[PDB]
Write a protein that binds this ligand. Structure first.
Ligand SMILES: *[C@@H]1O[C@H](CO[C@@H]2O[C@@H](C)[C@@H](O)[C@@H](O)[C@@H]2O)[C@@H](O)[C@H](O)[C@H]1NC(C)=O
Ligand SMILES: *[C@@H]1O[C@H](CO)[C@@H](O)[C@H](O)[C@H]1NC(C)=O
Lengths: 15, 50, 29
């Protein structure tokens, strides 16, 4: 349980 | 939604339904991105900035 | 370089957050 970071879309998780 | 870069974030909803992802669009003419602030809690009573 | 830090995706994935899990009322790690 942890509210994680941004989905980080575009270090961006998504790109 | 959570990707303003791809999804229009013009709010289609109100009346407190579903928590809202809240970001900060960056105001600088290079990489205007949306820094993820938080998932809006259903209730906010105190906010503070410094 | 391979890793889970970044993922070149055809489409970004708005909502990637929480992704948490738990077992209430259960002896659990
Ligand atoms: C956010 O709220 C939306 C509610 O607005 C309604 O749906 C959109 C698509 C427009 O057609 C608008 O005119 C409607 O009144 C939901 O539709 C949407 O699914 C919600 N998004 C999430 C991620 O829950
Ligand atoms: C944005 O950042 C880049 C990074 O090098 C810089 O070249 C550019 O001048 C910056 N522009 C603004 C408006 O901050």
């Amino acid at each position: 349980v942890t509210l994680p970071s941004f989905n980080a879309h575009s270090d961006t998780r998504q790109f | 939604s959570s990707n303003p870069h791809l999804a229009t974030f013009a709010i289609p909803l109100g009346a407190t339904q579903v928590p809202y992802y809240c970001f900060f669009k960056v105001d600088t003419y290079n990489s205007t991105v949306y820094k993820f602030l938080a998932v809006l809690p259903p209730t906010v009573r105190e906010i503070v900035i410094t | 370089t391979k890793g889970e830090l970044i993922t070149g995706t055809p489409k970004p994935l708005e909502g990637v957050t929480d992704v948490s899990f738990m077992t209430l009322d259960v002896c659990t790690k």
